[PDB]
Design a binder for this molecule. Structure first.
Ligand SMILES: CC(C)C[C@H](NP(=O)(O)CNC(=O)OCc1ccccc1)C(=O)N[C@@H](CCCN)C(=O)O
Ligand SMILES: [Ca+2]
Ligand SMILES: [Ca+2]
Ligand SMILES: [Ca+2]
Ligand SMILES: [Ca+2]
Ligand SMILES: [Zn+2]
Length: 316
């Protein structure tokens, strides 16, 4: 909407106060004009018709329980935009400052979040398995990263290419969580998963097997559930990424860690310069090796560590 840029205040899903960029024109809207061509947050009003209505508020204060998922979807989309711009010189998901749109309060009891080809969508959860999913910064960044992937490598959402697609979203979701630097970890979704159980998460990158996901190519799933295991076999790539950053010895193979920033540079370059819609795990290894060679040199520790990490997870 046309209006003037304003700054509101509210509380997110976990009860934390934050400022949000809004737009005033009769109402205050969740429209942040400070980033690209805008970040826009919508109310889906418990229905499944998208996007719903651009979020409107009478007083620019967002402290109602119903407001909390919108506050966080809006704010964490801004953090994710900032990560891609400041760290990777990427302007929004398409590289040309496309408007970023999210809808919250999607459906009833909906235990998921997704990119629908055009926008982000967040359920409220059923209150037992999940609380409103935009409360997780790793979740929000996971979803926006699907848009980045779709505009760049275009990884098809099935089998090995789809597991790479998933891992890319978990990797950058985690790197955005570290960028914001609030309780960062190598777990996925911990802030919104199972409010009645402490210390768990939906997936682990540091130890995928903790939640039943493979940590070695020999343990990959090859059935048809979950689009051929896209959220299962992602563990193999998530583990490799964790090892590249943090190091470790895994199935007897030692990896010297090179840190999160270099992990992010290598995988961002692989995603945007080398991967294709049908890349498999072996092709990802080659893309990561080439990316690290471009950035750091063929004889570098960074290249050697990429090779060790993929060796450790059984990907040649
Ligand atoms: C980070 C977590 C909290 C959310 C994440 N959701 P996602 O991977 O972005 C779901 N996207 C998806 O399916 O895209 C395909 C598509 C949909 C619509 C239109 C076009 C294409 C996820 O890991 N979901 C799991 C766990 C879900 C537990 N109930 C899961 O779906 O099995
Ligand atoms: Ca209000
Ligand atoms: Ca965390
Ligand atoms: Ca996390
Ligand atoms: Ca929990
Ligand atoms: Zn995903």
């Amino acid at each position: 909407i046309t209006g003037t840029s304003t700054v509101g205040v509210g509380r997110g899903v976990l009860g934390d106060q934050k400022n949000i960029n809004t737009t005033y024109s009769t109402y205050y809207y969740l429209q942040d004009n400070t980033r690209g061509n805008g970040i826009f947050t919508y109310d889906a009003k418990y229905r499944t018709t998208l996007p719903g209505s651009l979020w409107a508020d009478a007083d620019n204060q967002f402290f109602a329980s119903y407001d909390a998922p919108a506050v966080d979807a809006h704010y964490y989309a801004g953090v994710t935009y900032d990560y891609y711009k400041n760290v990777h010189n990427r302007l929004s998901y398409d590289g040309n400052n496309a408007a970023i749109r999210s809808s919250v309060h999607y459906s009833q009891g909906y235990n998921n979040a997704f990119w629908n080809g055009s926008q982000m969508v967040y359920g409220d959860g059923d209150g037992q398995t999940f609380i409103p999913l935009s409360g997780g910064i790793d979740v929000v960044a996971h979803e926006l990263t699907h848009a980045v992937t779709d505009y760049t490598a275009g990884l098809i959402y099935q089998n090995e290419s789809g597991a790479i697609n998933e891992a890319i979203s978990d990797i950058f979701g985690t790197l955005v969580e570290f960028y914001a630097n609030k309780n960062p970890d190598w777990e996925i979704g911990e802030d919104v998963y199972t409010p009645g159980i402490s210390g768990d998460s939906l997936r682990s990158m540091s130890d995928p097997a903790k939640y039943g996901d493979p940590d070695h190519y020999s343990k990959r799933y090859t059935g048809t559930q979950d689009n051929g295991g896209v959220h299962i076999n992602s563990g193999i790539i998530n583990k490799a990424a964790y090892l590249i950053s943090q190091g470790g010895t895994h199935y007897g193979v030692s990896v010297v860690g090179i840190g999160r920033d270099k992990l992010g540079k290598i995988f961002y370059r692989a995603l945007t310069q080398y991967l294709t819609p049908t890349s498999n795990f072996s092709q990802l290894r080659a893309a990561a090796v080439q990316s690290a060679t471009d950035l750091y040199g063929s004889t570098s520790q960074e290249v050697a560590s990429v090779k060790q990490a993929f060796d450790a997870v059984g990907v040649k």
